[PDB]
């Protein structure tokens, strides 16, 4: 199994729709690697169109909680909940491969109330990670747009562009 | 296997719809762990929207019965039965991650009795009065990690680990 | 594998709807454990809402035949055929967990035969009258953990592990 | 896999529909068991609603060919081909568990010829007459565990272990 | 598993309907047994109702090609292509079990062409006349174990191991 | 696994209808056998009714590229893409089991691109069978089976595998 | 597993539809081989009708990013994304087997943006003008192996292991 | 249409499972006959296992509401809502065919579910002549009445032997 | 519509599986034929394997209640309920066409009650005993049109409009 | 055709799920009856568990538009939109039969609040209830017997028997 | 047939998903009523969530072509293609029932942008708004109430009661 | 029925896929109208994305065959076969509605048939056989006037006057 062998090189993959089980499988992997060695870096390859907020947040909170710095490489695309986790990687360790696309955007009374709290919480965290203002993120997260690798770096969404192994 | 390897540090996951067989899987692990070492603590991660009530109660009863303290870290969400089992954790060893979400939610003779019995246990674990639980479960309640501590659903929040 | 590794502490799980496939998988585990050590007690966890009468009766008959006592622990629920098998465990070793719940009910002529025998068989196991069984199974009587001990359907409630 | 370990106890299962592929797996095991030890009895557990005759006849004729006496133990039910395979067990070693059902019931000229061939073998294994079997099998024949011993389909009720 | 050990006794099964993928698995087995010991015989049990003329004739030509004799033993039924491949076995080493049926039974340009080829090979193996082979191909014909010996499909019936 | 054992005897099996995945597997085994011993022959048994062109054409091109001679033994049937790959075997090492059944007239895959491919097939087949283009084109379009000895005559295969020695 | 074995030779396969997970499997294989020996060439056999742009642009970006040159052979066919990744291989080291097919054919504002970037890369690797690619990708353009070499999609035909 | 013709004989059929659309027809038919002659009796031929309660009550109330007395005639069976609407027939005009049989059974949600259950017993008892509590435990047990029994249960009046 | 003007000739057809909604159509036809003229005989042609009991029973009771006699005619087949309904006609006006199959066959307390009832109603109409009606329904019985007249099932055969 | 004949006495039936094509049929009937007689009352019998809001609101507005008063009668049940169209009848001409069940409960976030809010106003406007009573009743389900319905102000009066 | 009797009062219904065959049925009745009397008004009731372009465009072009002025009335909802046809009615004669609901969210990118630009041109044209405005407002998600439809100029006026 | 009543106005409709059975109904109509009055014209409203060739050609040949002039009118769209028939109407009387879309785009025996239709299409549109062989290869969308300049259609119907 390749995925197991690449785990020995502390590399984890995030592929496809984010839902409970693949998230739990990522959280499992992160906690495992930390256990093996809490000092070295985890490498998370993100290629996801997005998915369930509740699922993706478990992955986020694991990245922050564990002592290892998690490094997020975006290959292919990082849209919405994907983008969110890509930008949530250890500071100075977030990358795009050159041709990858990042994108942002995602009874009655009691539930509308809750999505609005959640939405505000996302924006607050995402501004904090990209270095943008809370206000700027609000405008841009409504804008159903795609950033290129360079633009994601200009936007503070990732740090630099992976281009060639040195 | 990553999950079986994670069982060598006494960590069990409860993920997704709480259903009869995934419930059984959890009970099998807890028993197994207890058998390896009935002293050391178990850590049960909970990311579930809820599920079948009899299936949930089997998870519950095993946690109380088995000798080890079962710690309950909630990640993502613990709604309905998820919340129940989260609050079911060893007193002092129940945690939310920061951006976790928790929710209070959910033959007539039997179901009315079943509900009442939950409401009681619910109060017991949170430390809120029967009446307090009784109003919130009826009318869908959401709780963030700080609120989850406030309510008594969990003890503290996990943020980082040094 | 966690079910197999529990099997070598003589633990067996009966879960979900009873039916031939799951049934003669339990019957195969019992015969297995007997062969290893015909003296040591087998432990059978029961969380089923009932099932196929054939399938269940195969487990009933297997529990009796084998030398080892089959202690039966109810968790979550034990409805009709599941209640039958719970009660059909080793007299003296029929446990409940506190928040479980037991419950009973269920060529036409010869269906009434099978009905009659079940009634008889459960009276033999509970300690009750064939009249009371015939009364309480006509209407679907729900039983709490303590109420189950009162009815002789189970022996004592497992609460904590000493 | 529990079942292949029980093959070390010379136990072979016969569950579910009697069709060609499963029937072959029975044969293969019996033929394998003979290889290991030609003297020691084989134990064919039979919980089957019956199926294809030809599939059943492979199992039947293999039983008679190998050296080991094949002891048929019935459980749950043994209908049509199931019954037939059960009654086909070694004379003196055909058993039943207390609550097991047993049943006997069921391109043209050959149909009436296979029918008769079955009846002859039925009567020759039960101790009955092919006059008696013909008249008696024709419909809805649910012989209970005792009825089956006093029809001569099996030899005794297995209740408990030696 | 079971089949890969019966292969250490040079024993192969032809189970169910004949088609390319099962046929190909059998040709792999025969080739393998030849590779291990070209001298010792192979043993091919057949319970087939028939199948693809293509798939069968690949089994046929491997049997005829590989050094070892392929003794055919029949159980249950050998209909059409199975009947064919039962007769295709080594002269002298073709066997029936007592209650095993056989059935000799089965763009014109070629279908007739290959038909004649079957009938010719059929008569070459059974020692029958090409017209009686034609009578039984065209109009269906069943043969019980002893009839198959008399008709010439197989050499003898197997009764017991000795 | 029986098929993995027979790989130590450098025997690959082309069973059923030819498509990308089964074909990739066959290619994978050819390259693998070449890896382990590039001189010793490889034995492709074919029982196939045909299939996709590009699936088969990777099996074909692999056969021609690798150092080993790929003997094709045919059993059961080789129809269309089956027949093609049968005839594609190393020369002098292409066989028929006596009651095998070779056949030609429709492979499997914008009309002028199809006619170009169809022409390429007919050419390669002609080259392998030693026939003219003329003939291949006439007879492919004709709906009839070939027996083992007829495929020998036509130059599809070289001889009949008969009995082992 | 045969694909494991060829990975010791640094051979990877890209068969069928280009899709997020199968693609992750290729990225994963390429990284593994990089780890093992960053100098020695990787060989990527392609037989695909194309697929998803994100899936393929992860295989593309890696091919460029990892140290070793990813030589690419095309067998059978490489259509749309297949062709693109085929022409993305190391300069000097892109091949077609003799009888293969290469083929180049294809919110909505960003769809045109992606298509443009795509065409620009296609031109860069083929040594062709952007506007030429823009016509060939639009009107479905088939290419024989010699036509793929002339077009500059691949470098040479790969006829025999010289 | 055969049913159309039998309608100007003032005959309507309640057949199969009781649900909104067929019940809506039965009500439309009864509303229609009232329009014709408000005094002449309607004859409702019942033959049904039962169905939805909301559906059944739309029939029941249209029977009680319209001027005409609705005569009822069980044929084959009248189970559950079939048993209910059969006994709802105009006092003194409820019938069974000799070999026809009758049978009677079938959180804030619970509150209302028990209300209905309570009401249906009160209407049953009221129409059957039995006490409210007689009906109560006699629906929990599933009850299979013969035609003569249906009269002894006070559910129907008499049996139908032949025409006059 | 054929059946409309053929109902002007007072002919009804009972064809197929006798269910509620087709039974209701027959009842309507009868009541309708009565209001037209309550003394001329209605003619019911039965070609049915039978079906639901409650359906057939309403058809039965109507025939009796309505004044005009319901002369039955068996064409094709009258089996189970169709067979029953056939014998239900006016004693003196029940017919079988020369070539017609009549066969006799067919909440447990009630099934045994209603099965009893069927029998005695069949018995009273036929002139047979309760014993013989019970005897012939358990296993098969195919009465030919002559045998049916002999059985007291119908009155006489209709060979010709003479 | 029974329903056509009943239409001659200005009787129209609302039955089952409220959706486009069944509602469109009801509006076509209501417009027809206006075209025949602009003055005389129309009687809409209701037996519906609810359905699509858009569909119900085309019934709602047709009832208010056409000159004829549309008298609503309730048979069986009137839940969600059912209860809404039931209250929409002519002030004074809204009935339940004695055993009519009436249920009051709720069937692009803030969008729906705006629709929800408007419905409540109409409800409180037809029932004479407080806006907050309609708000509270339609956030937890609410059951009404025929008498309860009358004192809620949902319908006007019960229909016992004929005249 | 209630719709056929309604047709004899020059009333047509456009209900549900707009697709080729039901749109043909509408185009059929329009030509028919033009043949019946070319000078007198036709009335189209719209309760559609939208649907296919080509199908919706045949109705549109038929409306503009026939000599009768087509009066559009919105009952229930008119979203996207429905709203497009709603606003396409003869100027003056376009209506919304009070609680009706109008929406204008987006109904080969080479061609699909050409079609989109055309749609917005025609929309702006029929509304009296700028192309630039219609371009921005169709961009994202909001329903319009009957009055908001009148102010934006989708529709000319709310139908009150039968005057 | 609406369509029988419009049939009095010698109006026929082509809607949806052009398969065998709908095509028959159209040929059955066109024949009926000719029987009713052979001089007076037939107005065929096309709104179709194309379909079966044998079906389309039965409509096409009936049109040419019968004495009434068949004025084709496009509404919505006329793609491939739909287009084919649109431009197969009586010359002079082939129309588009303002917002119509025409499209033209679709073994040894196939290439024959392809030519045969390219010939008739070229013969009906005016422009050369080769010019058509190019434009049917490309995913073509002609608007109303674009269609006119191409000669698929003769003018745009704007208003009844
Ligand atoms: Ca590189
Ligand atoms: Ca070059
Ligand atoms: Ca208020
Ligand atoms: Ca209030
Ligand atoms: Ca105009
Ligand atoms: Ca005007
Ligand atoms: Ca705006």
Curated annotation (Swiss-Prot), chain L:
InterPro entries: ClpP, ClpP/crotonase-like_dom_sf, ClpP/TepA, ClpP_His_AS, ClpP_Ser_AS. Induction: By heat shock. Part of the clpP-clpX operon. Fourteen ClpP subunits assemble into 2 heptameric rings which stack back to back to give a disk-like structure with a central cavity, resembling the structure of eukaryotic proteasomes. Component of the ClpAP and ClpXP complexes. The keyword Hydrolase applies. GO terms for molecular function: ATP-dependent peptidase activity; ATPase binding; identical protein binding; serine-type endopeptidase activity; serine-type peptidase activity. One of its GO terms (biological process) is response to temperature stimulus. It comes from Escherichia coli (strain K12). One of its GO terms (cellular component) is cytosol. The active site is at 80 (nucleophile), 105, 139. It catalyses: Hydrolysis of proteins to small peptides in the presence of ATP and magnesium. alpha-casein is the usual test substrate. In the absence of ATP, only oligopeptides shorter than five residues are hydrolyzed (such as succinyl-Leu-Tyr-|-NHMec, and Leu-Tyr-Leu-|-Tyr-Trp, in which cleavage of the -Tyr-|-Leu- and -Tyr-|-Trp bonds also occurs). Disruption phenotype: Cells undergo an apoptotic-like death upon DNA damage characterized by membrane depolarization. Decreased persister cell formation upon antibiotic challenge probably due to increased levels of MazF toxin. Its EC number is 3.4.21.92. Coiled coil: none annotated. This is ATP-dependent Clp protease proteolytic subunit. It comes from the Bacteria. Cleaves peptides in various proteins in a process that requires ATP hydrolysis. Has a chymotrypsin-like activity. Plays a major role in the degradation of misfolded proteins. May play the role of a master protease which is attracted to different substrates by different specificity factors such as ClpA or ClpX. Participates in the final steps of RseA-sigma-E degradation, liberating sigma-E to induce the extracytoplasmic-stress response. Degrades antitoxin MazE. It is found in: Cytoplasm. HAMAP family: ClpP. Keywords: Cytoplasm, Hydrolase, Protease, Serine protease, Stress response, Zymogen. Pfam families: CLP_protease. Acyldepsipeptide antibiotics bind in the ClpA or ClpX binding-sites, rendering the enzyme ATP-independent and indiscriminate, thus killing cells. Inhibited by benzyloxycarbonyl leucyltyrosine chloromethylketone (Z-LY-CMK). The keyword Plastid does not apply. Belongs to the peptidase S14 family. The N-terminus (residues 17-34) interact with ClpA and ClpX.
């Amino acid at each position: 199994d390749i995925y197991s062998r690449l785990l020995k090189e502390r590399v984890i993959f995030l592929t496809g729709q984010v839902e409970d089980h693949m998230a739990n499988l990522i959280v499992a992997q992160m906690l495992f690697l930390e256990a093996e060695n809490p000092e070295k870096d985890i490498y998370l390859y993100i290629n996801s169109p997005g998915g369930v907020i509740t699922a993706g947040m478990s992955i986020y909170d694991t990245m922050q909680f564990i002592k290892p710095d998690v490094s997020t490489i975006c290959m292919g695309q990082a849209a919405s909940m994907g983008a969110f986790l890509l930008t949530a990687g250890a500071k100075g360790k977030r990358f795009c491969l050159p041709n990858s696309r990042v994108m942002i955007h995602q009874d009655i009374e009691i539930h509308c109330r809750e999505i609005l709290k959640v939405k505000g919480r996302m924006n607050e965290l995402m501004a904090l990670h990209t270095g943008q203002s809370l206000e700027q993120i609000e405008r841009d997260t409504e804008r159903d747009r795609f950033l290129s690798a360079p633009e994601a770096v200009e936007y503070g969404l990732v740090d630099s562009i992976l281009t060639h192994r040195n």
